[PDB]
Amino acid sequence: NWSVEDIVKGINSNNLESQLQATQAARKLLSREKQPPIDNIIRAGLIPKFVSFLGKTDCSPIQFESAWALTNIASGTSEQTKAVVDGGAIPAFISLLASPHAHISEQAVWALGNIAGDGSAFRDLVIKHGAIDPLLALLAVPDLSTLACGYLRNLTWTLSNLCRNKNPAPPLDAVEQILPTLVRLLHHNDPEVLADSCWAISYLTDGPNERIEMVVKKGVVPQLVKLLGATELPIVTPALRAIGNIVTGTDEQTQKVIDAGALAVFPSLLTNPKTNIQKEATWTMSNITAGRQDQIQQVVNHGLVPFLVGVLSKADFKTQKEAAWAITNYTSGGTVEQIVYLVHCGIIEPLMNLLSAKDTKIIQVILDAISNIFQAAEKLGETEKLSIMIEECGGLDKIEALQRHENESVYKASLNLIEKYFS
C-alpha cells in the first residue's frame, strides 16, 4: 500500500510502466473501505494525469486503472465529483465507451453514472457531450440476456441517473431518445435491472402531465402494475412510486393505472409491514379518490374502503395523514351513495379520534371531510342522525376544543358545524 507521495513520484516519472504501477496503487488506495484518501489525491494534482491516461489507447491497463481511480473520486462529494469534471474527464470517459475491452467500457459507464448522479447540471453536461448515443449503442442487441449481468446492471443504473434530478427535468429529446431502451430494461428478468429501471420511470413521471404522458404512451403501466406485486421490496418501492406519480396526472392517465388492475394489489399494499409502502400506497389512493365518481366507484368495488378505514384507525402518523386526505378527496367528489357507504364502513370514529393530533393540517383536512359528509346528510335528511354518531364516539367534545384553536382555518371550520348541526 503506497503513500500518496510515492504515487506522485511514480506518476511524475514519465515512465509509462512506472505510471501504470503508481496508478494501480492509487486505485487500491481509493478502493479502501475505511476513509479513501480522495481529498489527498485531489490536492496532489493527480486528476489531470489520470484523465490523460484515459486516452492511452496502446496501454489499456493504464486506461482501466485511471478510469477506476477516477470513478471512486467521482463517487464522493459534489466538490470531489466537480474535480473530476474540471479535469476534463467527461469527454474522455465518453470516448472510452467505444473500448473493445468490456471492463474498460463498463468502467466508463460507471464513471459517467457517478458524474450525472451529482445533479441536473452535470447530468445535462454529460448529455451535451453526447453520451446518450454511445451508451445506447452498447445495448443495441436483439436480446439483452446475451449481455453480461454486471455490465447490464451498470448501464441500467447510469441511464437511470440521466433520468433523475428535476429543476430542471432532463431534456425532452434526451428522455425521448432514452425511453425505448428503458422499456426494454423494464421487461428484463434481472431484479437489479428491474429496480433501477423502475426508479428511472419514477423519475420521468415525477413531473407535469406532459412528462407523465410520454411514459404512459410507451405502454409501461401494465408492466409497472406487474412489478407492483413483486416479492422484492427494491422493486415494489420504485414501481409504487412510479404508479403514484402517474395518478397525479389527468383522470385519463389515472384510468390507465386502474385499467391495468393496480387496485387489486392495494389490499396488501395498504397493510404492508414496511411503513413507507403503506404511506405511499395511501398517498396513491388519495390521488385516485380525487378522480371521477366512476373511479371512486372502482375503489369501492375493489373493497378498498375498509382498508382506508383500517389505515385511518391504526398506522404510522404520516400514513394516517395521507388517509385523511384520501377521505377528504373521496367525500369531496363522491356521490351521496358513495359517502353513505363510507360512513357505513365505520369512517366516523377513526376520523374523530385523529382530531387530537397536534398537527394543524390534518385537523383542517378532517374538518373538511366532516363538512362534506354533512352535505350528503342534508341531501338525505339525516343531518341529525350523523350528529349523534359524532357525539356518541366522543367527536363532539373534540370539535368544541378546536373552537379555541390558534389557527384561523380551524377557528371557523369548527364553529360552522357547531352552529349548523349541533346547536
Partner: peptide, 5 residues
C-alpha cells in the same frame, strides 16, 4: 385535488 409529492 391532486397532491403531487
Amino acid at each position: 385535488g391532486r397532491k403531487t409529492r
